[PDB]
C-alpha cells in the first residue's frame, strides 16, 4: 500500500488527540483560575501538568506528524522536533511526583503543612522542574546524538541538501539515551518513587484511622471497667488510662469538649484517690454526656477528613498510573529495539499505536478530575453551562 494511506490514518488520529488534549486541559486551567476553592498548592502542579498536555497538542503532536514523514532537515533542528516531547513528559513526571509528595506531607504533618507548602515555594518548584525538564529532554542536543554519523544513503535517496538528514526519530536520537537515560533513570525511577510515596500515604491514613478507633474503644472499654469495678484502685487505674488516651486524642466546640472530658476525668480521679468509689463512678458516668455531645462528633469529622484524603490520594495515584500505562508500551518497544538487535523491529503500525497511546495520556487527566473530584466537576458544568446558556 502507498505509505500516504496508513500515514493519513495516523495523522488524523494524532490531530483528533491534539484537539481533545487542548480543550480538556484548557478547561482545567480555566477552572483553577476562576474558582478560589481550587487554588491550592496541589492544583498548581495540576495546572503545570495541564500546561504540558496543552503543549503536547499545540507542539508535540504537530512535531510527531512532521517527523513521521522523514523530511529533510538540519540534524539539530530534527533533534529539537524529536526531543521536545521528552521535555513535556519529563515536566509531567516532576508534577506527578510533586503532587504525591504534597499529599504525603498533608497526611503526615498536617499541622505543619501550610507552613512548609506555600504558593510561593510551589511556584519556585514548578519553575525549577521546567528548567530541569528542558535539560533532561534536550540532552541529545548537547552532543548525545547520531548527527555525527548521518545515514548518507537515505539522505541522498531523499535528495536532502548537504548538512541535512532524513529527519527520523530513531536515526537522530540514540537508543542508549532513550533506554538508559530517559526511561530507566528519568521515568522509571521517579515512577517507582511515586509508588513508594503513595504506599506510604495509604499506610499513614490506615494507621491514623486505627489510632482514632483505638482511642474511642479505649475510652469506652475503660468506662465499662469503672462501672463494674468494686475497688477505688481499679477506678483510678482505668481513669489514668483514659486521661492519657484523651490527651493523645486532643493533639491528634471540640476544643471545649476535650476540656470538659479531661476535667470530668480529673474530678472522678481526685474522688477515687480519696476512697470515694461510688462517687467516683457517679462522676465517671457523666463522661457519657461529654462523649455523646462532643467526642463522637470529633471522631466522625476526623474520620471523614482522612477518608477525603484517601480519596484525593487515590485520584492522584490513578493519574500517575495512567501516565505509566500510556508511556510504558513506547518505552518497552524501545527496549526491544535496543536490547534485541536479533529481533525484527516492531512494525510501523505498532510504532504508530504506541506513539498515539503516549499522546492520549494528555487527554485523560481532565476526565479523572471530572469523575473523581466534585469541586472540578461543578466548575466544569458552570464554565460549559454559562457558555452554552
Ligand atoms: C509556537 C512557538 C512558541 C514555538 C514554535 C517554534 C518551532 C515551530 C520552530 C523552532 C525551531 C524550529 C526548527 C529549527 C531548525 C530546523 C531545521 C530545518 O532544516 C528544518 C526546520 C527545523 C526543524 C525547524 C522547524 C520549526 C521549529 C521547531
Ligand atoms: C513496572 C516496571 C518494572 C516495568 C519495566 C520492565 C521492562 C524494563 C522490561 C519488561 C519486559 C522486558 C523485555 C523482555 C524481553 C526482552 C528480549 C531480550 O532479547 C532483550 C531484553 C528484552 C527486550 C526485555 C527488556 C526489559 C523489558 C522491556
Ligand atoms: C500494559 C503495558 C505496560 C504492557 C504492554 C507490553 C507491549 C508493549 C509488548 C507485549 C508484547 C510485545 C512484543 C513481543 C514481540 C515483539 C517482536 C520483536 O521482533 C519486536 C518487538 C515486539 C513486537 C514486542 C513489542 C512490545 C510488546 C507489544
Ligand atoms: C489508543 C487510542 C485510540 C487509537 C485509535 C486507533 C489507532 C491508530 C494508530 C494508527 C495505525 C493504524 C493502522 C493502519 C495502517 C498503518 O497505520 O500503517
Ligand atoms: C509558554 C507557552 C504557552 C503555555 C501554555 C500554558 C499555559 C498555562 C496557563 C496557566 C493557567 C493559570 C491558572 C491560574 C492559577 O494557577 O492561579
Ligand atoms: C514551556 C514553559 C512552561 C509553561 C507554563 C507552565 C506554567 C504553569 C504553572 C502555574 C503555576 C501557578 C501558581 O502557582 O501560581
Ligand atoms: C497544524 C499542522 C500540523 C502538522 C504540520 C505537518 C507538516 C509536515 C511537513 C512535511 C514536509 C515535507 O514532507 O517536506
Ligand atoms: C501558528 C502557525 C501555523 C503554521 C504551521 C504550519 C506548518 C506547515 C509548514 C510545512 C512546510 C511545507 C513545505 C513546502 C514545500 O516543500 O514546498
Ligand atoms: C502556537 C502554534 C504554533 C505552531 C504549531 C505548528 C508547528 C508545526 C511544526 C513543524 C513544521 C516544520 C516542518 C516543515 C519543514 C519543511 C522543510 C523542508 O521542506 O525540508
Ligand atoms: C516565542 C516564539 C519564538 C520562536 C521563534 C523561532 C524561530 C526558529 C526559526 C529558525 C529555524 C529555521 C532555520 C533552519 C534553516 O534555515 O535551515
Ligand atoms: C540544570 C539546568 C541546566 C540547563 C541549562 C543548560 C545550559 C547549557 C546548554 C547550552 C547549549 C549547548 C548548545 C549545543 C550545540 O550548539 O551543539
Ligand atoms: C492491540 C494490539 C496489540 C499488538 C500486540 C502484538 C504485536 C504483534 C507484532 C508481531 C510481529 O511484529 O510480527
Ligand atoms: C481519540 C483518542 C481518544 C482518547 C480518550 C480516551 C479516554 C478518556 C477517558 C479516560 C478514562 C475515564 C473514563 C472511565 C470509564 O467510565 O470508562
Ligand atoms: C518518544 N518517542 C519515542 O520514544 C520513539 N521511539 C521511536 N519513535 C519514537 N518517537 C517518534 C517518539 O516520539
**Using alpha carbons only, how large is the chain's radius of gyration in Å?**
30
Centre of ligand 5 to C-alpha 51, Å, is 6
Residue 124 has a CB neighbour count (10 Å cut-off) of 11
Centre of ligand 12 to C-alpha 354, Å, is 11
Q: Which residues contact 227 (CB under 8 A, 6 or more apart)?
A: 281, 284, 285
Is the backbone of residue 210 left (phi > 0), alpha (psi -120 to 50) or beta? alpha
Phi, psi at residue 10, to the nearest 5°? -55, -55
| Under 8 Å between Cβ of 92 and 323 | yes
Residue with the three cell numbers 499529599? 103
Pairing mode, strands 72-74 and 164-166: antiparallel
Centre of ligand 11 to C-alpha 7, Å, is 34
Report resolution in angstroms: 2.4
Q: CA 163, 151, 155: angle at the middle one, nearest 5?
A: 55
Q: What HEC string does the chain produce?
A: CCHHHHHHHHHHHHHHHHHHHHHHHHHHHHHHHHCHHHCCHHHHHHHHHHHHHHHHHHHHHHHHHHHHCCCEEEHHHHHHHHHHHHHHHHHHHHHHHHHHHHHHHHHHCHHHHHHHCCHHHHHHHHHHHHHHHHHHHCHHHHCCCCCCCCCHHHHHHCCCCCCEEECCHHHHCCHHHHHHHHHHHHHHHHHHHHHHHHHHHHHHHHHHHHHHHHHHHHHHHHHHHHHHCCCHHHHHHHHHHHHHHHHHHHHCCHHHHHHHHHHHHHHHHHHHHCCCHHHHHHHHHCHHHHHHHHHHHHHHHHHHHHHHHHHHHHHHHHHHHHHHHHHHHHHHHHHHHHHCCCCCCCCHHHHHHHHHHHHHHHHHHHHHHHHHCHHHHHHHHHHHHHHHC
Q: How far is CA 350 from CA 9, 330, 381, in A?
A: 13, 9, 37
Q: CA 95, 97, 102: angle at the middle one, nearest 5?
A: 90
| Under 8 Å between Cβ of 375 and 38 | yes
Q: Which helix (H) or strand (E) holds 125?
A: helix 119-137
Residue with the three cell numbers 540514540? 174
Centre of ligand 4 to C-alpha 337, Å, is 20
User: Could you tell me if the CB of 332 is within 6 A of ligand 4?
Assistant: no
Residue with the three cell numbers 534485541? 340
To test the pocket of ligand 10, the residue of 74, 75, 78 to mutate (highest count of ligand atoms within 8 Å of its CB) is 74
Q: CA 257, 259, 263: angle at the middle one, nearest 5?
A: 120
For ligand 3, atom 22, which residue shows the shortest CA distance?
346
DSSP 261-286: HHHHHHHHHHHHHTT-HHHHHHHHHT
192, three cell numbers: 517507582
Give me the architecture of the 209-301 domain, per CATH.
Up-down Bundle (1.20)
Q: Which residues contact 344 (CB under 8 A, 6 or more apart)?
A: none
Nearest to 234 by CA among 281, 267, 279, 285: 281
Q: CA 345, 347, 351: angle at the middle one, nearest 5?
A: 100
Q: Count how many residues are written for the chain.
A: 389
For ligand 3, atom 8, which residue shows the shortest CA distance?
329
Q: What distance in Å separates the CA atoms of residue 191 and residue 303, rounded to the nearest whole number?
A: 30
Q: How far from each other are the two terminal CA atoms of the chain, in whole angstroms?
A: 48
Q: What distance in Å separates the CA atoms of residue 131 and residue 227, rounded to the nearest whole number?
A: 66
Q: What distance in Å separates the CA atoms of residue 364 and residue 92, rounded to the nearest whole number?
A: 13
Residue with the three cell numbers 479531661? 262
Determination approach: X-ray
Q: What distance in Å separates the CA atoms of residue 67 and residue 85, rounded to the nearest whole number?
A: 12
Residue with the three cell numbers 505509566? 324
Residue with the three cell numbers 506531607? 105
Amino acid at each position: 500500500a502507498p505509505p500516504i494511506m496508513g500515514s493519513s490514518v495516523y495523522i488524523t488520529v494524532e490531530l483528533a488527540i491534539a484537539v481533545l488534549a487542548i480543550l480538556g486541559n484548557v478547561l482545567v486551567c480555566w477552572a483553577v483560575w476562576l474558582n478560589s476553592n481550587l487554588q491550592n498548592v496541589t492544583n498548581y502542579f495540576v495546572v503545570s501538568l495541564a500546561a504540558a498536555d496543552i503543549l503536547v497538542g499545540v507542539l508535540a503532536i504537530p512535531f510527531a506528524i512532521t517527523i513521521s514523514t522523514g523530511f529533510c532537515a538540519a540534524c539539530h533542528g530534527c533533534l529539537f522536533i524529536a526531543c521536545f516531547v521528552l521535555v513535556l513528559a519529563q515536566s509531567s513526571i516532576f508534577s506527578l511526583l510533586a503532587i504525591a509528595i504534597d499529599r504525603y506531607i498533608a497526611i503526615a504533618i498536617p499541622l505543619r503543612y501550610n507552613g512548609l507548602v506555600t504558593g510561593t515555594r510551589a511556584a519556585g518548584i514548578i519553575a525549577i522542574c521546567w528548567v530541569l525538564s528542558f535539560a533532561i529532554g534536550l540532552t541529545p542536543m548537547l552532543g548525545w546524538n547520531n548527527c555525527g554519523q548521518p545515514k548518507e544513503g537515505k539522505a541522498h535517496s531523499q535528495g536532502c541538501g548537504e548538512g541535512q538528514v532524513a529527519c527520523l526519530f530513531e536515526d537522530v536520537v540514540p537508543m542508549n539515551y532513550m533506554v538508559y537515560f530517559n526511561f530507566f533513570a528519568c521515568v522509571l525511577v521517579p515512577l517507582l518513587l511515586m509508588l513508594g510515596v503513595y504506599l506510604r500515604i495509604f499506610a499513614a491514613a490506615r494507621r491514623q484511622l486505627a489510632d482514632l478507633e483505638d482511642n474511642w474503644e479505649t475510652l469506652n472499654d475503660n468506662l465499662k471497667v469503672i462501672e463494674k469495678a468494686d475497688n477505688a484502685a481499679q477506678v483510678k487505674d482505668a481513669l489514668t488510662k483514659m486521661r492519657a488516651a484523651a490527651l493523645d486524642a486532643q493533639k491528634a466546640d471540640f476544643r471545649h469538649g476535650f476540656d470538659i472530658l479531661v476535667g470530668q476525668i480529673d474530678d472522678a480521679l481526685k474522688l477515687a484517690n480519696e476512697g470515694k468509689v461510688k462517687e467516683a463512678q457517679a462522676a465517671a458516668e457523666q463522661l457519657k454526656t461529654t462523649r455523646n455531645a462532643y467526642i463522637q462528633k470529633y471522631l466522625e469529622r476526623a474520620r471523614s477528613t482522612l477518608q477525603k484524603e484517601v480519596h484525593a490520594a487515590k485520584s492522584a495515584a490513578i493519574i500517575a498510573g495512567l501516565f505509566a500505562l500510556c508511556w510504558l508500551p513506547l518505552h518497552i518497544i524501545n527496549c526491544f529495539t535496543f536490547f534485541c538487535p536479533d529481533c525484527s523491529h516492531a512494525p510501523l503500525w505498532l510504532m504508530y499505536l504506541a506513539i498515539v497511546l503516549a499522546h492520549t495520556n494528555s487527554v485523560v487527566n481532565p476526565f479523572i478530575y471530572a469523575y473523581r473530584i466534585r469541586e472540578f466537576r461543578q466548575t466544569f458544568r458552570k464554565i460549559i453551562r454559562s457558555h452554552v446558556l
